[PDB]
Scaffold this motif. Structure first.
Motif, short mmCIF file in Angstrom:
data_model
loop_
_atom_site.label_atom_id
_atom_site.label_comp_id
_atom_site.label_asym_id
_atom_site.label_seq_id
_atom_site.Cartn_x
_atom_site.Cartn_y
_atom_site.Cartn_z
N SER B 172 47.70 -22.22 16.15
CA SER B 172 48.83 -21.34 16.42
C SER B 172 48.47 -19.87 16.57
O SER B 172 47.75 -19.33 15.73
N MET B 173 49.00 -19.21 17.61
CA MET B 173 48.85 -17.77 17.77
C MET B 173 50.24 -17.15 17.59
O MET B 173 51.09 -17.28 18.46
N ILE B 174 50.46 -16.51 16.43
CA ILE B 174 51.74 -15.95 16.00
C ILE B 174 51.91 -14.44 16.30
O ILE B 174 50.92 -13.70 16.32
N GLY B 175 53.15 -14.01 16.55
CA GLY B 175 53.50 -12.61 16.73
C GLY B 175 53.14 -11.94 18.04
O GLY B 175 52.88 -10.74 18.06
N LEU B 176 53.17 -12.69 19.15
CA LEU B 176 52.84 -12.17 20.47
C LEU B 176 53.99 -11.41 21.11
O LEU B 176 55.08 -11.96 21.25
N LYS B 177 53.77 -10.15 21.51
CA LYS B 177 54.81 -9.34 22.14
C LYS B 177 54.33 -8.84 23.50
O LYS B 177 53.20 -8.34 23.60
N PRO B 178 55.18 -8.91 24.54
CA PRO B 178 54.76 -8.39 25.85
C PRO B 178 54.82 -6.87 25.94
O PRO B 178 55.80 -6.26 25.53
N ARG B 179 53.77 -6.24 26.48
CA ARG B 179 53.77 -4.80 26.69
C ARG B 179 54.25 -4.45 28.13
O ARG B 179 54.59 -5.37 28.88
N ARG B 180 54.33 -3.16 28.51
CA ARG B 180 54.83 -2.76 29.83
C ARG B 180 54.00 -3.25 31.01
O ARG B 180 54.50 -3.29 32.14
N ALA B 181 52.73 -3.63 30.77
CA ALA B 181 51.88 -4.20 31.83
C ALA B 181 52.22 -5.69 32.07
O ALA B 181 51.83 -6.24 33.10
N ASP B 182 52.90 -6.35 31.12
CA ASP B 182 53.32 -7.74 31.23
C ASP B 182 54.67 -7.89 31.97
O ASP B 182 55.14 -9.01 32.13
N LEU B 183 55.29 -6.79 32.43
CA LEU B 183 56.58 -6.82 33.12
C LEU B 183 56.39 -6.58 34.62
O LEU B 183 55.49 -5.84 35.02
N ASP B 184 57.26 -7.18 35.45
CA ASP B 184 57.20 -6.96 36.89
C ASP B 184 58.05 -5.72 37.31
O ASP B 184 58.43 -4.93 36.44
N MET B 185 58.33 -5.53 38.62
CA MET B 185 59.12 -4.40 39.11
C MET B 185 60.58 -4.44 38.65
O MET B 185 61.22 -3.40 38.57
N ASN B 186 61.11 -5.64 38.33
CA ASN B 186 62.49 -5.77 37.85
C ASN B 186 62.62 -5.72 36.31
O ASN B 186 63.72 -5.92 35.78
N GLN B 187 61.50 -5.46 35.60
CA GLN B 187 61.36 -5.34 34.15
C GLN B 187 61.46 -6.68 33.39
O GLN B 187 61.57 -6.68 32.17
N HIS B 188 61.32 -7.81 34.10
CA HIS B 188 61.28 -9.13 33.47
C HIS B 188 59.81 -9.48 33.20
O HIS B 188 58.93 -9.00 33.92
N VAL B 189 59.54 -10.29 32.17
CA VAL B 189 58.16 -10.68 31.86
C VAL B 189 57.62 -11.55 32.98
O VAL B 189 58.28 -12.50 33.41
N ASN B 190 56.45 -11.17 33.50
CA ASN B 190 55.72 -11.83 34.56
C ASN B 190 55.38 -13.26 34.13
O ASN B 190 54.96 -13.47 32.99
N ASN B 191 55.58 -14.24 35.02
CA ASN B 191 55.36 -15.66 34.73
C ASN B 191 53.95 -16.00 34.27
O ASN B 191 53.76 -16.98 33.55
N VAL B 192 52.97 -15.19 34.69
CA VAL B 192 51.55 -15.33 34.37
C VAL B 192 51.26 -15.04 32.89
O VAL B 192 50.35 -15.64 32.32
N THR B 193 52.07 -14.15 32.26
CA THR B 193 51.91 -13.79 30.84
C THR B 193 52.12 -15.00 29.93
O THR B 193 51.42 -15.14 28.93
N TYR B 194 53.03 -15.91 30.32
CA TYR B 194 53.29 -17.15 29.58
C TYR B 194 52.05 -18.05 29.56
O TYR B 194 51.79 -18.71 28.56
N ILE B 195 51.27 -18.06 30.66
CA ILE B 195 50.02 -18.81 30.77
C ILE B 195 48.99 -18.23 29.80
O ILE B 195 48.30 -18.98 29.12
N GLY B 196 48.91 -16.91 29.73
CA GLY B 196 48.00 -16.23 28.83
C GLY B 196 48.35 -16.47 27.38
O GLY B 196 47.46 -16.64 26.54
N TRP B 197 49.66 -16.52 27.08
CA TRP B 197 50.19 -16.77 25.75
C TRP B 197 49.92 -18.20 25.31
O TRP B 197 49.53 -18.41 24.17
N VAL B 198 50.09 -19.18 26.21
CA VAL B 198 49.79 -20.60 25.95
C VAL B 198 48.31 -20.78 25.59
O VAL B 198 47.98 -21.52 24.66
N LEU B 199 47.41 -20.10 26.32
CA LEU B 199 45.97 -20.22 26.07
C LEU B 199 45.49 -19.50 24.80
O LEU B 199 44.37 -19.76 24.37
N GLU B 200 46.32 -18.62 24.21
CA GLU B 200 45.98 -17.87 22.99
C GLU B 200 45.83 -18.76 21.77
O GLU B 200 45.11 -18.41 20.83
N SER B 201 46.54 -19.89 21.74
CA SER B 201 46.44 -20.83 20.62
C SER B 201 45.22 -21.76 20.73
O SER B 201 44.84 -22.38 19.74
#
Ligand SMILES: Nc1nc2c(Cl)cccc2s1
Ligand SMILES: Nc1nc2c(Cl)cccc2s1
Lengths: 263, 265
Positions: B172-201
């Motif tokens: 388990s990788m606990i306490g992951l928060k997205p920073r401003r580089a993880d957001l797209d032009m509409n300020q939503h979290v980029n779909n690719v960040t979820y892939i990075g978060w999945v691989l953190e565990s």
């Protein structure tokens, strides 16, 4: 990408990508910081080379100590940006690498950056006293006469940065680097520190202002398993003072200043 | 970057960058995921989009990813050119599917392939719905009419059901928060960040002794800029297979689930 006619500088064009832009459809300062880094690696590759050929017999690497970036216009998504880079000896202190950012359609300077690099032992960390003489193999790849991106006497790139006093006005605590924040050698890339510094800047300032200048001093490296705290205090255009420190002991890793203009 | 001769697909070449590669000097799966995303935006731009139409904007409707399946054979090395071909196809009233083919620019051989399932959604209320008749007719002109699948196989792993990770998790990788580089032009979290978060565990030893072959990821709920996330992993299996679960720390709301397949180097 290619070295100029004299071989004393390198040039490279970059089309701005969709995921590289922020909420105003222009490249973020972290995207620009990554392009400066990319053109520096391709300039090192073109002349036969953070690691660099020779001096590896002493387990010696080049480490950043200061990064100063000043942007006038951020390139829009789809636009081409041309970056010219070069290095120059600063006696026994170390190396300086400068960049000039231009618009590929107008040919006008839209940004400029400067960095101070120092020789360090990759094993004992710290520094193996930066003062070399038989390291004259870099003088052949540098212009001999001074060529400064920030030439003016008494300019923002050479001003001393103070230490942020407690309590801070704003703070982003508990920041940890993920595997995308590491380079090929598994060290945290210097661009992540820029992103971490900007995390303490309130959202309102990012939405009502654009980043004009950013000076950042590197003191210690953050490991893959370290937790970081980002601190910010308005000192003033809006000016800020920044401090990155390890979330536990409070060991200082970074310090800097940012300057912002109203849109 | 350019549309092919028939106008039913788009192609683009990419030189692999220094900061885009991992410890093996080859592009990371997140870098590849960003290139698939970039070539999809340039394909939408080349056919007159911004991927909503005047009809979708009139109803405040947007396209959202529901599933992303990527399979890599060879990860391009730093300095190499990778050519990506992308196309879309209607799947009746369920929604659209976007496929990608990754090739080496020197050999011309397929080094990877990806598929995604997109659904229609009101951007304000987040309510999903089956594609309307007058909306579907506006996309059929930019899609090949005969089926063109990146994963044609009779029992391909891109359409297999993903179960929910049972507690307790192995890693388990606990306490992951997205920073401003993880957001797209509409300020939503980029779909690719979820892939990075999945691989953190995934433990470091597995990343150092194995290379990622397949990654299937299901999108259920989006993570806001102020949400905190927990990444969970359990070995289900030469090849090592894993089960993944991304959930919010505050109350455990499921946001993502998936599987990864790894082979020994
Ligand atoms: N220290 C130095 N590094 C360099 C590189 Cl990487 C390229 C060109 C000139 C120099 S001087
Ligand atoms: N839904 C669809 N969007 C597209 C785009 Cl953006 C490009 C080409 C074909 C299609 S079908």
């Amino acid at each position: 990408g290619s070295l100029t006619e004299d071989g004393l500088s390198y040039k490279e064009k970059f089309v701005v990508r969709s995921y590289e832009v922020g909420s105003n459809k222009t490249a973020t300062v972290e995207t620009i910081a990554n392009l400066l880094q990319e053109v520096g690696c391709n300039h090192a590759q073109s002349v036969g080379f953070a690691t660099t050929t020779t001096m590896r017999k002493l387990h010696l690497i080049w480490v950043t100590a200061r990064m100063h970036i000043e942007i006038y216009k951020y390139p829009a998504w789809g636009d081409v940006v041309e970056i010219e880079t070069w290095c120059q000896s600063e006696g026994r202190i170390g190396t300086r690498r400068d960049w000039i950012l231009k618009d590929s359609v107008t040919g006008e300077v839209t940004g400029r950056a400067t960095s101070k690099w120092v020789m360090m032992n990759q094993d004992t960390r710290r520094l193996q006293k930066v003062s070399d003489d038989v390291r004259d193999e870099y003088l052949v790849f540098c212009p001999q006469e001074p060529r400064l991106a920030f030439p003016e006497e008494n300019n923002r790139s050479l001003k001393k940065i103070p230490k942020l006093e407690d309590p801070a006005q704003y703070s982003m605590i508990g920041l940890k680097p993920r595997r995308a924040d590491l380079d090929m050698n598994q060290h945290v890339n210097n661009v992540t520190y820029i992103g971490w510094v900007l995390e303490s800047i309130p959202q309102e300032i990012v939405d009502t202002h654009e980043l004009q200048v950013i000076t950042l001093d590197y003191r210690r490296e953050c490991q893959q398993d370290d937790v970081v705290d980002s601190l910010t205090t308005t000192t003033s255009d809006s000016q800020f003072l920044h401090l990155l420190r390890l979330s536990g002991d409070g060991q200082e890793i970074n310090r800097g200043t940012t300057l912002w203009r109203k849109k």
